[PDB]
């Protein structure tokens, strides 16, 4: 016997007490150890409505990750609201770790186990758990990295696909690796490598899903129409360095109408001057460290926006987007909601 409810959650993790790595340090003081034998009870003949777009767990994780970044990735200079802040800006060890979100006494988390669940509506296979799965708090745009995969078909998530102002989340069912590197000795020059055969196969499957939602209209991908570099480029943080990558080459319509099924290499740049995703101001960091900077990640999702208009063409156009970091958390927490016992 329960009802939907909000409360302050706590976090659990496997952070290492001997690590200097920044996610570990934060978690050692802010989270508790995980349960090696977590209990999960499946509820027979039970149906629940979920709404991933209104799930306060999302709001709480955002607050947490902001706090983490505010304490850690402090810049040499911070320009916010007209003031200038100068402080020490040492190089750090940076590599996200999985974080579990857990309910306090008197509360529990319901989990939707429907394989093709889109994030909103009734769920027939519901279980109760104390903690979510382990989520790495990866901040990125355009492409979702190192996340969890869909268990069956690719899933399109939107509060309302017909409403062009709502961001679309594409949940992939098969991972595509992205290999970004700054070769040892222009210190800001980098590049990301993507399997063109795997990627072009997978993106098309996404297109077939979009056709299912848009009355079999033609699906076209296009580059972003504008905005800050953090949104128009695939931005993320690798080993403490802020990478900005051009994804123009990723969404090329031509190769699936040849000679494309090869390796795709995107040009990237490490930036010292960044627009903080925290929404405050501009931040200045020190030049990149020396040597080979390499991060290999799984692409597990895509963030899209569909073009608005008074149109009635035979095409629907989608462009990579994001910038609302809440969407990143939404993509992982979509199957969970908090309820109050008694």
């Amino acid at each position, epitope marked *: 016997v329960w009802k939907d409810a909000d409360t302050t959650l706590f976090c659990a993790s496997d952070a290492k007490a001997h690590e200097t790595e920044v996610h570990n340090v934060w978690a050692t003081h802010a989270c508790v150890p995980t349960d090696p034998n977590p209990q999960e009870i499946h509820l027979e003949n039970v149906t629940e409505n979920f709404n991933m777009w209104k799930n306060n767990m999302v709001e709480q994780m955002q607050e947490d990750v902001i706090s983490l970044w505010d304490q850690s990735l402090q810049p040499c200079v911070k320009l916010t609201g007209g003031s200038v802040i100068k402080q020490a800006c040492p190089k750090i060890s940076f590599d996200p770790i999985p974080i579990h979100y857990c309910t306090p006494a008197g509360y529990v988390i319901l989990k939707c186990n429907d394989k093709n669940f889109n994030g909103t509506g009734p769920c027939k296979n519901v279980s109760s758990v104390q903690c979510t799965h382990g989520i790495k708090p990866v901040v990125s745009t355009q492409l979702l990295l190192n996340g969890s995969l869909a268990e069956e078909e690719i899933i399109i998530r939107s509060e309302n696909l017909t409403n*062009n102002a709502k961001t679309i989340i594409v949940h992939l069912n098969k991972s595509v690796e992205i290999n970004c590197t700054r070769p040892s000795n222009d210190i800001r020059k980098a590049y990301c490598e993507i399997n063109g055969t795997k990627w072009n196969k997978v993106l098309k499957q996404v297109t077939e899903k979009l056709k299912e939602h848009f009355n079999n209209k033609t699906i076209i991908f296009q580059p972003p129409s504008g905005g800050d570099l953090e*949104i128009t480029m695939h931005h993320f943080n690798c080993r403490g360095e802020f990478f900005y990558c051009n994804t123009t080459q990723l969404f090329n319509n031509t190769c699936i109408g040849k000679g494309c099924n090869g390796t795709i290499t995107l040009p990237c740049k490490i930036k010292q001057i960044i627009n903080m995703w925290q*929404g405050t101001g501009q931040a200045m960091y020190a030049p990149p460290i020396d040597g080979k900077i390499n991060c290999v990640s799984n692409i597990t999702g895509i963030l899209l*926006t569909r073009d608005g208009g008074a149109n009635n063409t035979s095409n629907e156009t989608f462009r990579p987007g994001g910038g609302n970091i809440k969407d990143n958390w939404r993509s992982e927490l979509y199957k969970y909601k908090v309820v109050q016992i008694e």
Partner: antibody
Amino acid sequence: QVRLVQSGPQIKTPGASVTISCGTSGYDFMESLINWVRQDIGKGPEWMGWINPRGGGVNYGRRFQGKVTMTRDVSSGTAYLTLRGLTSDDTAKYYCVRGKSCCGGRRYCNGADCFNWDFEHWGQGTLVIVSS
Amino acid sequence: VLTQSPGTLSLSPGETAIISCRTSQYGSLAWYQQRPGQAPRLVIYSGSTRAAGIPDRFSGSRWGPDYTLTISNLESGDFGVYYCQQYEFFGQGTKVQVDI
């Protein structure tokens, strides 16, 4: 007190460029998407596009693709619209609009989280004439 | 996607003006009011919900695809052109004409 104050009217030569402003005050400029609408008397209102004050994300209508760019100044809390390669067809009045708010005092809000289309707040508009 | 009708209503104070608007799609609808030379003013939003500061004389209703806005006891303050709106789509407009 949620006021939208647009810049004054202006005439331009066929081919020039217009940059009209949209002054905002009385609300956190970063929590609401800002739309742009075009009204030519003789016809009805036409939505041109919205921009997210947060990241700068824009959604241009296919009919206005390449003739329209939407920017912003997070400092002054001001939205902007610049028109490229003016023709006699661009002779119209241009509004900057936003919908009803849904944040309700939350600390971290994004304009893409609200509905946006319930246009309650309009500017006074700005006349742009493209004639020789 | 949107078809508003009629184009012009020549009515008088006291009478009840009826403005219809058929949609190919469906969902949330708003009704706007444009006094000559002035910016449009939100009157009905989300279908039937009356906006703030709107007198009871204005009300929204539906029956199938044909959305309607009925205005009871007209006054000269109700003069102007009205538009229906689904998301970013607007109607052609209904020019309601006040009279003396």
